[PDB]
Structures are given as C-alpha cells and as structure tokens.
C-alpha cells in the first residue's frame, strides 16, 4: 500500500533549461526507487535504479536524488526527445507500486497549424454514412479551437476529435476533427467548412469545400 505520489502532474519547460520531478513515498521506501521514462506509444525505459544510480546507456543529464520519504529526478539541457511521461516505482516491499507519472511537454516557438479538409469518400457514401475530416498538422501550443460550419450554420454535437502526443523532433502537435452525418443529411447541404482558431494565427482560418 506504499502510495507513491508524483508531483507535479503536468510540466512545460523550454529546451535547454532544467526539469525537476519529485516522487514522495508515503511510508519511506529508503533508496529502493526507480525512475522509468515512457515516450509516446513505446514501452517504459529504465533511467535510474537505486536512489540515483543511472542505468546503462543513459546520459548524465538525468540525475536522481532522495532517501526515505522524498525523491527527485532532474533533467538538464532538455532535448525535444525528452517529451515523455516519467514514472517512479518502489521495490522496498511488495506489492510493487508506481507513481501516477509526470508528463513533460517541451516548450518551443509558436507554430501555426496547416489546415486541410477532406470530403467523405464516394465509397463511404454508398454505405450510408459520411465522414468529413479536418486536419491541423504540426503546430504548437496544444490548445486550439476547431468549429464545423455546414450550410454555413455552426455544428454542435456531431464531431469527435483526437490529438497526437507531442512529436519528439519538432515538439509539435497534430489534430483531427471528424464530422459525421448520415448520407441523406450530407446530400441536402452544400458547403462544408472547419474554422480554426490558434494562438499562432492572427485571425481564424477556414478551409471549405462545396459538394460537387
């Protein structure tokens, strides 16, 4: 039941600065701690076993520190490859527990999205549904607003969207809003558009297509 509490949960730091995570055991694990790094998609990779003894093939930018009820993993001069969630685990006594982790965004210069709109396929329409897709590629800060306008009226409740984890080279994000309609409702309306507000665009951006 050794509850490990990782604080803080979110971090955004500028490249080449210094990120500092803390793991704080509830009941003194005493030097028997580990720090794993999980990049997007990938399995975890061990960084630091013992309190602060870096594992094989890890660069020395990563440093551990701590004993008993309080620990610290710090990374200096951050590369963009270091965008990851960071977990701490104890092995003092069973059962083995992990912290909830600490996602770390790597800051970069602001970048405006490229926007692309994709009309549904003629093949999909023979099914009985229609799927319009808006793509905002390679952009930063993560926050963005994507609004769907059909027949020029604003849409609500009929789009989902999903965003990538921060890219590990450029430090950007990419996003896909998908608007879904039945075939019939899609054939009655003519003009389809997604309006994109982003901190790196002086004013909103619309990409549109007229059916036919």
């Amino acid at each position: 039941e050794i509850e490990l509490t990782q604080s803080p949960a979110t971090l955004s730091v500028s490249p080449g600065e210094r990120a500092t995570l803390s793991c704080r055991a509830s009941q003194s694990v005493s030097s028997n701690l580990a720090w794993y790094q999980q990049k997007p998609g990938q399995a975890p990779r061990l960084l630091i076993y013992g309190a602060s003894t870096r594992a094989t093939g890890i660069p020395a930018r990563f440093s551990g520190s701590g004993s008993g009820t309080e620990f610290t993993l710090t990374v200096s001069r951050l590369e963009p490859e270091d965008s990851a969630v960071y977990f701490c685990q104890q092995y003092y006594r069973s059962p083995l527990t992990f912290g909830g982790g600490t996602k770390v965004e790597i800051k970069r210069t602001v970048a405006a999205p490229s926007v692309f709109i994709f009309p549904p396929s003629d093949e999909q329409l023979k099914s009985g549904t229609a799927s319009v897709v808006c793509l905002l590629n390679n952009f930063y800060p993560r926050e963005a607003k994507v609004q769907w306008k059909v027949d020029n009226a604003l849409q609500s409740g009929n789009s989902q969207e999903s965003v990538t984890e921060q890219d590990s080279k450029d430090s950007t994000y990419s996003l896909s809003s998908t608007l879904t309609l039945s075939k019939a409702d899609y054939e009655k309306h003519k003009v389809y558009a997604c309006e994109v507000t982003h901190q790196g665009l002086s004013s909103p951006v619309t990409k549109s297509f007229n059916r036919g």
């Binding site: 794993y36 076993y49 013992g50 685990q89 003092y92 982790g101 549904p120 897709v133 590629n137 896909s176």
Partner: protein
C-alpha cells in the same frame, strides 16, 4: 537484446488469457520475470512475478488465485496467464525481466526493471469483434499536400497503419482512435507530401487489425 510478446487478444468476461515472452537473440543472465499492466491512458500497475532463484511468487491482491507466471529455464521465455477476466482487466500488459537483485527478503527478490517487452493489449468485452473499413482521404490544391486514410467501425483495439509498406515515415501522423457512439472505434492516419509528387508517386496505406485477422491496403490517389 529485447523482449517479444504475443499478439493482442480479446477475451469475453470470465475467461482466461495467456501472453508469452520469446527472447529475440539468445537467453540472458536474469533472475526475475514480472508483469505490469497499464490501462488505456492510466499509469502502471504491478501484477506479479517469479524468482526462479528462490522458487517463489508474489502477486497483487487484485490477482490472488487468478494469475500464473511461468519462466521456462531453457528457452528463456515466459508465458503468463490471467483467469476470471473482468472488463476492468482491459489494458496493455508488459513482460519485464530483471538482471541482478537488489533486495531479497521474506523469500523473494526485488530490483530495478531492466528490460521491458513491447506490450500486449488484451481487451475484455462480450462485444463481438469487427474489423475496420478503410476509406481514402484524397488530396487537392502547389507546395506540400496532405493525404490520408480513414479506419472506421472496428471494435477491439488496436489497429496499426503504415504507408507504402513501411517505406514512408516522415510527416506521418496516426491519430489516437476515438470510440464512436456506435461502440466501434475510428481512426485516421495522414501524411504530408510535396505537391509535385502526386500522379507520379503512389501512396498506399496498410492497416492491420489482428483481433480479426484482417489487413487492408488502400490506394490513395487524387480524384477526378
């Protein structure tokens, strides 16, 4: 020098699942096989382990009487079995090997988790599996273009995609599946490509969905 786990199974609630850990390369000096799971977007949860050294086992109480962790001395591989499966067990499972111990007490040995496997997603659901349908995100316009593939209405995760049978890598973005109202997932993969490229260069997306043994390759060309 790395661990290889079985494919991603999907089991109905109340049944059992077995996950393996063949070792690419040879076997290697290690003392422990453990398993840790990570639910969809959650953190890590230890499941249990063997230490053949002492012939002993540890589990978490979630798994008491439900789990069995095996280490074949010869092959250097571990199968792992989890019975009486709940919807709550749906997660990615990780094989983990440890090389040298760091504390032994009470008949078990604990250490660093030196080596991790690729991960294995087992989904527990009475829902029937359905494989995807794949439609093209064709492009149009004079500089860089963007084309894609839409993977719709498939129930068990996961779904992997690649472009030109792994040939194309740069500027590819494949999005986190979103679960639809229907109860099926949907996913989109795209890639940014020079405008001059089209017509000449062919673009095909290859999407596998092993829980249904279906792979579909889809050709993506600009439309007339």
């Amino acid at each position: 020098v790395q661990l290889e786990q079985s494919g991603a199974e999907v089991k109905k609630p109340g049944s059992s699942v077995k996950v393996s850990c063949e070792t690419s390369g040879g076997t290697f000096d290690n003392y422990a096989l453990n398993w840790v799971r990570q639910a969809p977007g959650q953190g890590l949860e230890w499941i249990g382990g063997v230490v053949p050294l002492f012939g002993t086992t540890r589990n978490a109480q979630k798994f008491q009487g439900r789990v069995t962790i095996s280490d074949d001395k010869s092959t250097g591989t571990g199968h792992m079995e989890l019975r009486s499966l709940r919807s709550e067990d749906t997660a990615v499972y990780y094989c983990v090997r440890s090389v040298t111990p760091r504390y032994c007490g009470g008949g078990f040995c604990y250490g660093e988790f030196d080596y991790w496997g690729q991960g294995t997603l087992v989904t527990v659901s009475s829902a029937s599996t359905k494989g995807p349908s794949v439609f093209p995100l064709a492009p149009s316009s004079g500089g860089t273009a963007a084309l894609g593939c839409l993977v719709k209405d498939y129930f068990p995760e996961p779904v992997t995609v690649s472009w030109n049978s792994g040939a194309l890598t740069s500027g590819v973005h494949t999005f986190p599946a979103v679960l639809q109202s229907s109860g099926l997932y949907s996913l989109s993969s795209v890639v940014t490509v020079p405008s001059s490229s089209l017509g000449t260069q062919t673009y095909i997306c290859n999407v596998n969905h092993k829980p249904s043994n279906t792979k579909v390759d889809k050709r993506v060309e600009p439309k007339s």
